[PDB]
Scaffold this active site. Structure first.
Site, short mmCIF file in Angstrom:
data_model
loop_
_atom_site.label_atom_id
_atom_site.label_comp_id
_atom_site.label_asym_id
_atom_site.label_seq_id
_atom_site.Cartn_x
_atom_site.Cartn_y
_atom_site.Cartn_z
N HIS A 87 -20.78 19.23 -60.78
CA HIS A 87 -20.76 20.51 -60.09
C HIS A 87 -20.18 20.43 -58.68
CE1 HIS A 87 -23.18 22.97 -63.18
NE2 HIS A 87 -22.42 22.08 -63.76
N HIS A 98 -21.46 14.71 -71.59
CA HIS A 98 -22.49 15.09 -72.58
C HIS A 98 -22.90 13.90 -73.44
CE1 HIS A 98 -21.35 19.56 -71.86
NE2 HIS A 98 -22.02 19.00 -70.85
C1 HEM Z 1 -16.71 22.94 -70.91
C2 HEM Z 1 -17.19 22.26 -69.86
C3 HEM Z 1 -18.64 22.22 -69.74
C4 HEM Z 1 -19.62 23.10 -70.11
C5 HEM Z 1 -19.68 24.53 -70.61
C6 HEM Z 1 -20.85 22.44 -69.68
C7 HEM Z 1 -22.10 23.09 -69.86
C8 HEM Z 1 -23.33 22.46 -69.53
C9 HEM Z 1 -24.62 23.08 -69.60
C10 HEM Z 1 -24.79 24.49 -69.96
C11 HEM Z 1 -25.59 22.18 -69.25
C12 HEM Z 1 -27.10 22.51 -69.23
C13 HEM Z 1 -27.59 22.77 -67.87
C14 HEM Z 1 -29.09 22.79 -68.01
O1 HEM Z 1 -29.62 23.73 -68.72
O2 HEM Z 1 -29.78 21.87 -67.53
C15 HEM Z 1 -24.87 20.94 -69.03
C16 HEM Z 1 -25.45 19.69 -68.78
C17 HEM Z 1 -24.82 18.60 -68.39
N1 HEM Z 1 -23.51 18.48 -68.28
FE1 HEM Z 1 -22.07 19.72 -68.83
N2 HEM Z 1 -20.60 21.19 -69.31
C18 HEM Z 1 -19.31 21.04 -69.19
C19 HEM Z 1 -18.61 19.90 -68.72
C20 HEM Z 1 -19.21 18.76 -68.15
C21 HEM Z 1 -18.52 17.66 -67.50
C22 HEM Z 1 -17.03 17.53 -67.23
C23 HEM Z 1 -19.54 16.75 -67.16
C24 HEM Z 1 -19.41 15.43 -66.53
C25 HEM Z 1 -18.36 14.66 -66.67
C26 HEM Z 1 -20.85 17.28 -67.54
C27 HEM Z 1 -22.08 16.66 -67.54
C28 HEM Z 1 -23.31 17.24 -67.85
C29 HEM Z 1 -24.51 16.50 -67.88
C30 HEM Z 1 -24.64 15.06 -67.47
C31 HEM Z 1 -25.53 17.40 -68.19
C32 HEM Z 1 -27.02 17.10 -68.31
C33 HEM Z 1 -27.99 17.48 -67.22
C34 HEM Z 1 -29.29 16.79 -67.31
O3 HEM Z 1 -29.52 15.84 -68.12
O4 HEM Z 1 -30.26 17.26 -66.52
N3 HEM Z 1 -20.52 18.46 -68.29
N4 HEM Z 1 -23.51 21.15 -69.27
#
Ligand code: HEM
Ligand code: HEM
Ligand SMILES: [Cl-]
Ligand SMILES: [Cl-]
Ligand code: NA
Ligand code: NA
Lengths: 713, 713
Positions: free
Chosen positions: B77, B244
């Site tokens: 972010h 993810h």
């Molecule tokens: C199409 C692009 C993306 C979409 C729509 C997206 C969407 C999301 C959403 C909706 C969450 C859940 C937030 C929550 O409810 O806690 C999340 C979690 C996360 N995203 Fe993404 N994401 C995207 C790309 C990325 C990228 C580029 C990274 C890192 C390289 C990332 C890493 C993470 C991680 C690590 C979590 C987990 C948070 C946790 O374990 O507390 N995502 N993502």
């Protein structure tokens, strides 16, 4: 373009504290206006202004061939925004050339005036500020038309952007009272800090209160607004009748002909506004206020004709060509000249607000006395004109040039000349030692010097520790100042002073004003010692003690802190949140965000709070100068909750045990909430920040102690 | 409190240029973050971060006992607001801790993450910035979980207030497309400069476009927004799958249980927000996005399980406990662990946007290759992660500390190392003399050096004269750079360079990058000589020449000026008035209002305009460096009107004769209209200002020439 104010309209705004940055200012950081003005050939400037008075430009032709009237109005407007409640407004910053004031309706066609002065501004450059030049031009207008002024001081430095001033909440120019954002309530009570009756007026509505042409009820508004600009009844009659001895109003045709104010005009208008579709749009056809009143038989020369007409005729209500209410003399001959056609003449006319000077009982006594004694009218007007145009200049030490009056005036909060040798470094060490040996505590010393110095406001440069007014009425009795504890400290300092002065040779002595400040210095040095830091606080002697007879008690009342976040003090309950009041007070004391943060966090741990409150005292070593406030405030082991009894008091409790650690106000906790302030607190609350905190604290302390020291400037 | 923006909502806003003042900064004026960081024990910091990953705080319990996933999200972010169109956003200023970003819906519960880092921030103080620490924490998360990162560079200095960025016009968080402030039009075209599909999202909607769960159409949004963050298909797949691989989403119960975002929360929340009434509010009951998806069987360890699941199951649409659309593998066993209860297990789940990586045909080829070759996936993700988090850091000269990668990447716009002695003062004087003897004119010299240096933008620190990319594709063919005139100047400078280098001893030589700038210096010195003033323009050698092969042409496209008010250039017709585009460019060049004013008024009289237009050339001594622009612009003897042919072009005519004197654009005339800008123009248009104008012009010229010279920082 959606902004943070759009999403979070109520969040605290700090941008007011970082206005007037070296970024917006085109002059270098080393530029010193006082030095530039001191070199100006003021005599030459005044000759150029004299010539200007009768050099009519075709784009805004001079009435009666002489701009004097217009320029007196321009200068009375520059100075007439001033409010005593906060010291904001007034002529001292040339704010008339910026938004919103350049576009207020009561400033209509003053854009023309200002542009007529461009060739003079341009010739003399930086050696004369717009701020000074607006006032000087008004002086010269007066002199050209036969009126001897009381004097002039230069020194008003230009500013380079709009100040943030609360001018009211109405969202409609000139909105009448009783709307959703009404500035009135109750029995016609105008909300503080405002000093005008409608948004975009200087003081009152020339047609009468909310448009109702009742001179008696208009008098009530005039008296109230003028008092809120520091004028009494005599000064008010003198100024209004003085002024309307000159010139004319403009209302040749319907106001619908007048177009966009300067801030809304097209780019091609090049800074000007109120372009008129009425006939030629200018001169004989000018429309400014919508009134069409010429008061005297000689609008370009001083006379005694204003009061002759006011009392010599009976008045009948009538309408100007634009449909506004005004008055005309019953059965008079057409004795008043026309501004452009020598073959036309007009009957005497008056504004509703002019008639106030006759139909208000108290004003009538003064007007009659001026009528019968025109020498007393002329001298009162000279004096009130000087006051009007100098009231926000600050101490006399700021007054520059060859025309400064020698007479010392009560309104200037005069400080006596120092006539004796000052204390030196050894002497200040000897005095600090005696202060600390007397038993006075860090909390006492600090709270007292805070109370003396923190009265200053940079808006009108009134206040500060010079004078030792804290010992006088009314400051010694202010609740914020803790009158009984104050009285004990001052007794002890006054005995120290007496004994020091008694022992001197050669007439060396120390003022109580300096001693108050030096003692506060000692208490800061002791607090630093308490925390294991060897610190020396700067101190500049040279303050002097004012007398009670030099200290107008009624005028001093507006300086009373009713909110001082720096002492966790709120005198009563306000609609404005306490944190908003803190930032306002910071603004008055000229502090930036970082300086406000450091200074509040230190004062807390030094025991500057009113009534010895524990609110925000987040240390277990009270009276030691440390960064404890910040470290503890930011400790996520503590959880904060508003109390049952009072939503504006918070309990901080250990998150695991539930035990009570601290209590705090909104003033305290906003530093752990607001995202910019919390960023600042975090710098001071870091493990490498103990020395930085102490040094930045001592600097902002000394800044505050010296805010009124224009004798050293 | 009614404000100027309320009365005049469309006036130009200059406050964007006087952000980041010394007034708001708590650090001393001499503080140098690079110096502070260079002495940080980075290894110690990373050890404390490691420990933190598995030390759960009760107010925000760690999922699976490990904060890693949260911190990866936090760092993604921090970096993911970046747009290539203006370089604004990105992690390089730590803006996530300020409004509005700290309170965007996509940043929900990242306030928890930041607070979990306060003990470490506090410990190391000024030697590690928040900006740096957000990125470093995400690296350490990755490393702790078994993933090898590509490197890390320090050097992001903290900022102390919000930047003003255009994030869109919607007045409702997360507003679907097609509203009264829609950021889309045509067939799904997102307006520049935006790079997200809804206000307060990072890139796309995880449920699908405007909530429609169609993976195929969701892929279209992903590809468009990611391209607007400078990422191609390969880097997009890698970053999404990479991310993810860790952690989980949070949607334990209905969204309505979640309260006010940080900027709207009560003061007692102490900077935190989204307080939840759902059960415990945290931990197993956490609600963040409203989705409830855990992607892998080992959410706390790197693996290749994301693609194993994505391809190994068939997916069916379902709803989370908060009612949001997501996907589940019904044929699977319950293999995915629960974040808190060791006795519960869950079936595999995916977001609609995860499935895009499989059902978009181009993404599927890349995803399959990653699936089959997870060593290639790890490498692509390490590289894209470094790019994502460093993309706005600027030249490699700014990269600090022990972990900087040695590999030079094309995306960094690399500059070759200088391997030879530099020219000295005498040499620069000899070269200035040769440039001037060749016949190149003041206009050619100044225009060329302006075109080379003025590509710089401080938002991402890309552009500037270093590298001599003006001679390469695509800069040499940009219309603003006047490709044919440019070609002639560069030929002549290249012959000068060749002859100088040919004559040297000891391997001394001059780059074409340095010579273009030195030549522009010579033109400014000659223009001053033309006006009768001898000045020396400062000059710092050390720039080097990049090759075509070191220049990504497609990435260079965003740096093309389509509006450059400093050359009176507008490539086509925009909805945004030209004056607004001027201030935006000034902001990118890091100029204050005074520097923008001086700079433009000099450039006009030097013959910098595109196509040799006469617009704003208010001088009869073109190519002489004088204050003529301001003196003539401010002359009230000239009257301005929009032309019949073009409302954005104005004719200035003598007010008495009607004779045509000048023509100008909105860019020119705003300096005679806007009340703050006109006050500036007045200082430079005064009779005492010839020296000041020349000195301040040379200082800003030099500033511009050096904007990318972090090698001298
Ligand atoms: C199409 C692009 C993306 C979409 C729509 C997206 C969407 C999301 C959403 C909706 C969450 C859940 C937030 C929550 O409810 O806690 C999340 C979690 C996360 N995203 Fe993404 N994401 C995207 C790309 C990325 C990228 C580029 C990274 C890192 C390289 C990332 C890493 C993470 C991680 C690590 C979590 C987990 C948070 C946790 O374990 O507390 N995502 N993502
Ligand atoms: C109750 C207080 C006041 C009221 C309501 C008021 C109202 C006005 C109005 C409505 C005008 C006409 C503007 C126009 O149409 O051009 C005017 C003109 C003027 N006023 Fe006042 N006035 C007040 C006090 C003052 C004071 C204190 C001074 C100066 C000491 C002043 C000096 C002037 C002058 C010189 C003009 C004439 C401008 C010209 O000749 O163009 N007035 N006043
Ligand atoms: Cl003000
Ligand atoms: Cl930004
Ligand atoms: Na003031
Ligand atoms: Na950026």
């Amino acid at each position: 373009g959606t902004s943070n104010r759009d999403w979070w309209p109520n969040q605290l705004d700090l941008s007011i504290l970082h206005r007037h940055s070296s970024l917006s200012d085109p002059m270098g950081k080393d530029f010193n206006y006082a030095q530039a003005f001191e070199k100006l050939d003021l005599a030459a400037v005044k000759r150029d202004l004299h010539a200007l008075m009768t050099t009519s430009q075709d784009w805004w032709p001079a009435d009666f061939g002489h701009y004097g009237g217009l320029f007196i109005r321009m200068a009375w407007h520059s100075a007439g925004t001033y409010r005593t409640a906060d010291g904001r407004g007034g002529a001292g910053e040339g704010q008339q050339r910026f938004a919103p004031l350049n576009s207020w309706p009561d400033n209509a066609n003053l854009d023309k005036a200002r542009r007529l002065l461009w060739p003079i501004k341009q010739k003399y450059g930086r050696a004369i500020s717009w701020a000074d030049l607006l006032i000087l031009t008004g002086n010269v207008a007066l002199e050209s038309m036969g009126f001897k002024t009381f004097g002039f001081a230069g020194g008003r430095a230009d500013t380079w952007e709009p100040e943030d001033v609360y001018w009211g909440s109405e969202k409609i120019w000139l909105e009448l009272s009783g709307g959703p954002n009404s500035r009135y309530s109750g029995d016609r009570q105008l909300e503080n800090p405002l000093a005008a009756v409608q948004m975009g007026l200087i003081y009152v509505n020339p047609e009468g209160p909310d448009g109702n042409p009742d001179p008696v009820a208009a008098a009530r508004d005039i008296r109230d607004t003028f008092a809120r600009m520091a004028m009494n009844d005599e000064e008010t009659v003198a100024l209004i009748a003085g002024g309307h001895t000159f010139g004319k109003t403009h209302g040749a045709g319907p106001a619908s002909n007048v177009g966009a104010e300067p801030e809304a005009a097209g780019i091609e208008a090049q800074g000007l506004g109120w372009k008129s579709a009425y006939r030629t749009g200018k001169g004989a056809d000018a429309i400014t206020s919508g009134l069409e009143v010429t008061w005297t038989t000689t609008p370009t020369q001083w006379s005694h004709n204003f009061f002759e007409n006011l009392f010599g005729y009976e008045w009948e209500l009538t309408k100007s060509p634009a449909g506004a209410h005004q008055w005309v003399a019953k059965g008079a001959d057409a004795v008043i000249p026309d501004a452009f056609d020598p073959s036309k003449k007009h009957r005497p006319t008056m504004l509703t607000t002019d008639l106030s000077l006759r139909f208000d009982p108290a004003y009538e006594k003064i007007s009659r006395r001026f009528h019968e004694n025109p020498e007393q009218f002329a001298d009162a007007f000279a004096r009130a004109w000087f006051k009007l145009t100098h009231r926000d200049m600050g101490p006399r030490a700021r007054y520059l040039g060859p025309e400064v009056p020698a007479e010392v005036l009560l309104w200037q909060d005069p400080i006596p000349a120092v006539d004796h040798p000052l204390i030196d470094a050894a002497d200040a060490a000897e005095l600090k030692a005696k202060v600390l040996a007397s038993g006075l505590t860090v909390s006492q010393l600090v709270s007292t010097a805070w109370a003396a110095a923190s009265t200053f406001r940079g808006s009108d440069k009134r206040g500060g520790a010079n004078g030792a007014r804290i010992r006088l009425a009314p400051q010694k009795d202010w609740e914020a100042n803790q009158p009984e504890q104050l009285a004990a400290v001052l007794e002890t300092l006054e005995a120290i002073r007496t004994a020091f002065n008694g022992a001197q040779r050669g007439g060396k002595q120390v003022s109580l004003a300096d001693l108050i400040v030096l003692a506060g210095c000692a208490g800061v040095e002791q607090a630093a010692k308490n925390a294991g830091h060897a610190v020396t606080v700067p101190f500049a002697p040279g303050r002097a003690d004012a007398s009670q007879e030099q200290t107008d008690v009624e005028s001093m009342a507006v300086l009373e802190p009713v909110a001082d976040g720096f002492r966790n003090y709120l005198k009563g309950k306000y609609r404005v949140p306490a944190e908003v009041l803190l930032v306002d007070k910071a603004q008055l004391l000229t502090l930036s965000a970082p300086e406000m943060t450091v200074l509040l966090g230190g004062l807390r741990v030094l025991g500057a709070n009113v009534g010895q409150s524990r609110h925000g005292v987040f240390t277990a070593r009270e009276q030691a100068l440390t960064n404890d406030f910040f470290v503890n405030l930011l400790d996520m082991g503590t959880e904060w909750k508003p109390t049952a009894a009072d939503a504006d008091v918070f309990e901080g409790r250990d998150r695991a045990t539930g035990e009570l650690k601290w209590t705090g106000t909104r003033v305290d906790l906003v530093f752990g909430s607001h995202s910019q302030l919390r960023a600042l607190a975090e710098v001071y609350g870091s493990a490498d920040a103990q020395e930085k905190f102490v040094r930045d604290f001592v600097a902002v302390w000394n800044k505050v102690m010296n805010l009124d020291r224009f004798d050293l400037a």
